[PDB]
From a paper:
Here cryo-electron microscopy analyses of human CE pre-B complex and B-like complexes reveal extensive structural similarities with their CI counterparts. The results indicate that the CE and CI spliceosome assembly pathways converge already at the pre-B stage. Add-back experiments using purified CE pre-B complexes, coupled with cryo-electron microscopy, elucidate the order of the extensive remodelling events that accompany the formation of B complexes and B-like complexes. The molecular triggers and roles of B-specific proteins in these rearrangements are also identified.
To that end, we first determined the three-dimensional (3D) structure of a human CE pre-B complex (previously denoted the 37S exon complex) assembled in HeLa nuclear extract on a MINX exon-containing RNA that was previously shown to undergo exon definition. To enhance the stability of the CE pre-B complex, we isolated complexes at low salt conditions, which led to the formation of predominantly pre-B dimers. Single-particle cryo-electron microscopy (cryo-EM) followed by 3D reconstructions of the purified CE pre-B complexes revealed that one of the major dimer classes comprised two similar units (protomers) aligned in an antiparallel manner, whereby each of the protomers resembles a CI pre-B complex. For example, in both types of pre-B complexes, PRP8 has an open conformation and the BRR2 helicase domain is located close to the PRP8 reverse transcriptase-like (RT) domain (PRP8RT). Moreover, the BRR2 helicase domain has not yet translocated to the PRP8 endonuclease-like (En) domain (PRP8En) nor docked with its [name] substrate. Furthermore, U4/U6 stem III and the so-called [name] quasi-pseudoknot are present. We previously showed that the U1 snRNA is base-paired to the 5′ splice site (5′ss) of the MINX exon RNA in CE pre-B complexes. Owing to the poor resolution of the CE pre-B structure in this region, U1 could not be clearly localized, and the nature of the molecular bridge linking U2 at the branch site (BS) to U1 snRNP at the downstream 5′ss could not be discerned by cryo-EM. However, protein crosslinking coupled with mass spectrometry indicated that U1 and U1-related proteins communicate indirectly with U2 components, mainly through SR proteins that interact with the U2AF1 and U2AF2 proteins and SF3B1 that are located near the 3′ end of the intron. Taken together, the molecular architecture of the CE pre-B complex indicates that no major rearrangements in the pre-B complex are required for the tri-snRNP to subsequently interact across an intron with a U1 snRNP bound to an upstream 5′ss during the switch from a CE to CI complex.
Numbering used by the authors:
A (entry chain F): 164 to 522
B (entry chain M): 6 to 128
C (entry chain N): 539 to 587, 590 to 937
D (entry chain J): 385 to 395, 412 to 427, 434 to 475, 536 to 605, 627 to 683
The structure:
Amino acid sequence: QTWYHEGPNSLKVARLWIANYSLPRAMKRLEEARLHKEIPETTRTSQMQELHKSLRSLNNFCSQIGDDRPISYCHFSPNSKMLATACWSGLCKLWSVPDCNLLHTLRGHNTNVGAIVFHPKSTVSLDPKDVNLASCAADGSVKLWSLDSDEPVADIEGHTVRVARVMWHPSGRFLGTTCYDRSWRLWDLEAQEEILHQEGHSMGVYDIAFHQDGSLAGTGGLDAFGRVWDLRTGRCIMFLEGHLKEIYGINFSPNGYHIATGSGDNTCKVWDLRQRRCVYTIPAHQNLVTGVKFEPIHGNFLLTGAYDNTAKIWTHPGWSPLKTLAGHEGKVMGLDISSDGQLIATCSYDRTFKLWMAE
Amino acid sequence: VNPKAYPLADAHLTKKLLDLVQQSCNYKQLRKGANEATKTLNRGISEFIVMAADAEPLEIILHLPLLCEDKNVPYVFVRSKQALGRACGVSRPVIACSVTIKEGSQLKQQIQSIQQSIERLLV
Amino acid sequence: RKHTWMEDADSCVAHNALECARAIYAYALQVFPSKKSVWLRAAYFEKNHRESLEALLQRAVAHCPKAEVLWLMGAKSKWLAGDVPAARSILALAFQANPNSEEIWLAAVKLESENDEYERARRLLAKARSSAPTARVFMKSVKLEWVQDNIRAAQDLCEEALRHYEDFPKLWMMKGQIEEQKEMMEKAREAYNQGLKKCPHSTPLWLLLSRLEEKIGQLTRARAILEKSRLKNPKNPGLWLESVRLEYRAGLKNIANTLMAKALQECPNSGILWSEAIFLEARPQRRTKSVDALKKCEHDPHVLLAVAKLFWSQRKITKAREWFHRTVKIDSDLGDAWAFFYKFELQHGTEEQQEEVRKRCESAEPRHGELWCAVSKDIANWQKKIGDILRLVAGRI
Amino acid sequence: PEIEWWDSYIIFGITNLVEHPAQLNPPVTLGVYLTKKEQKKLRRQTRREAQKELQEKVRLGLMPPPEPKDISQGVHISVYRVRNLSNPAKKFKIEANAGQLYLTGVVVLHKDVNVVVVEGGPKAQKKFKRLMLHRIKWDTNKCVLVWEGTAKDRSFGEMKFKQCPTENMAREHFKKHGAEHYWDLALSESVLESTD
């Protein structure tokens, strides 16, 4: 019973721009996959063994306490510049990684802050005076913030429910936000307005994440059904099912097939996109897996957190327990790897944030 | 309900919490009242702390989760204070209760299960 | 019958007098030759109740062979009362009776390092390392090489001890303490990390690693090392107390209180954690925290020392002196309690209380203390007496 | 792969059409507690009603008066690893507890890697964990809990003590019931414990 509804022409123009920006990106990703497939198995196995040896000796360091509130989410800045944290208070600090020095803490929220995810091209090709990060609170608020202003920007008042997470598009002009109103909004940065409100779940969506090329976008929430909606005209055909608990974490792999979904049933679903099935159901931890993050542009691993004091870095593919990055004292909520792949921050409920670095 | 009341339990979760509170108050392991709950959280002998979302004002219970962040105790908010008062064995509605640990009580497994189920609701 | 006679002699020594107990001990020693236990009991009864102790040590050396503990007690009684080169000759004669270099060579090296001519002590340590090498002998050789000067030969000996005794964390801790006394500090942190990753459960090595990572700046790595030490034991009370002290050293008082509450929930029967929670509590809230520490951890020396410090801070010297006497009677081997009792006697009281505290500290040697091990492990106060160490622990409070 | 499925579907299929597809539901009684005074009042009322009934029966002439004088909506699934299932009573007691606890699963045995997977209710899984972790005394042979999560429905039918000397046969037997990932995680944890 998929009912259709007409939208404005600005949403169609943004969808056409997203398709025209994602189709050469998908062509370049297919060319890179064909070039990596032409490489022999010996050098690829040696690189995989070197990556496994670098991930196995991952020691935790620079466990800097943010504030008196427990950390709820963390997002790595582009080009390994900083790390924006979002605790249970109204402040969203930005710690200089790997120096672990807080600088220009972006405040302005009143309720418990959710997922403060920066733009993918914020430190790369965006000005620090303009909008660089996007934060959300426990109430209805999706506020933009700069990196050298310590003040929020004009937020989007189109959400009146609990905005759990928010993630910017890889193009930079769009940003998805999973709200508790049984829908997920897609605000625009150029049009400065919400372009669409995709309601693909009966319950409120928790985590929303776009693909590596920007064509698809994975959803998921308390309805226990993962939806992968296309940015052109909706029509989510890659429906992820199997998890009996609430999906609290979604992460898209750089490969076009694999997609990682974290649910509260103490497992993680690495599902395929070319076959529309679940390729692996990895038992990462025993607690509710809330945080989940894919690998960088190499695409070799996946770091999944949980409600326990540990976070498992598993291989991609394979779903093997490669690294047990424990050391926290609370529920590991929010984790993000850097753009270089050598550093990865894992926020926890012990009001502290460390970084796993290769010894 | 009140948006400041966090976390909010479900129907079966509140039923299990009311049953555990009745089993603790019948076995003399529960303390009713906000001042008794604050005294139990300050002494470090409180296993769990339950609040009420239907409190006017709820800000007088707002120090009850924050003290739960100072003593590492699970916190939960009930749907109504009259239901918590009826589960606490009193005709007056109770806005805050504290289930305290005992020296080898029989309800320690149910208290541990309620602490494990109340730690996943706050996410 | 000999065991019953020894029990009756111990009861008579504890009860009324010491002459009949000494007569019963002499009758039990002259009736039949016993093992080293009866000789050690007779030596302890002679030392607790000068010439009689030396006569008992000579009788134990003449009638009870292969007794290294009785020979060491006789050498200590000769060095304390009689003479140090006479005790050196007694240890050299005991080396000709027992050829093992387990405890006689270490005692001879300690007697040669307590006096001058430390080259003879280095030669004795080299002979002990060439005859029967061990981790304790290598640690004593590294300590004798590092007490004079931080030479590169001491670092080479510490590296050889870490290569030969990598399972023992004492050699890694000595190497980290030798490298921390040098100009650089990354080598000491690397040696402490290797000792923490090679033991793998080393509490003082992880405490020294956290102290080196906190004192040299960037305390976030020190907090990460403290969390890894608390999760690697798991749930150690010493690592939790070190993390609580590192959190209380900064401005995070609420995080330190939460860490103390987590350490109390993970280990309620801990004296050091209860003392840290009583010291971190408020002044009107300390009367309930001390009562909860006494109810949870009863007959504890650290809880009694914290109660004595709380009674001395509340301008109650008559209660603080009684609490210090109860702490000395419950455990007289504590260093922090003896230092607090000496500080309370020097702050409030005449010279008789300070003389009694000095006699109680010189009768039973304090060890395993918070302020005692901070001055007993340093190279500047390694070969010092017990009274000077007690005065330095009392003056640094 | 030449192109992805969404890239092949889009490349022209972009339009201003917002839809809500596949609205599916995700896979109640409250007790009342009465105070001491309420219980006393209820007891008094019940006693008065019983006395009135007795008086009515006596006055009616019927009889002389007395002489003065849920696996659904989520199933808890645990998986434990044991070094040696040799302990007959300990393994038997744990298996008996699981069987008495209407819990299904499997017990696969191999060279120094024994995977005991149970699935049932939470009160049965907690009792099975307390039996296997505190009641069943194994001793180098120790039993630890590898994982404990929740599933939609039960996978195995009944507790069958399977046996395979190789890891490939046990992995194929676990994949026949759709539980090869837990056995692979248990084997990886056993290999990481034996290596470290």
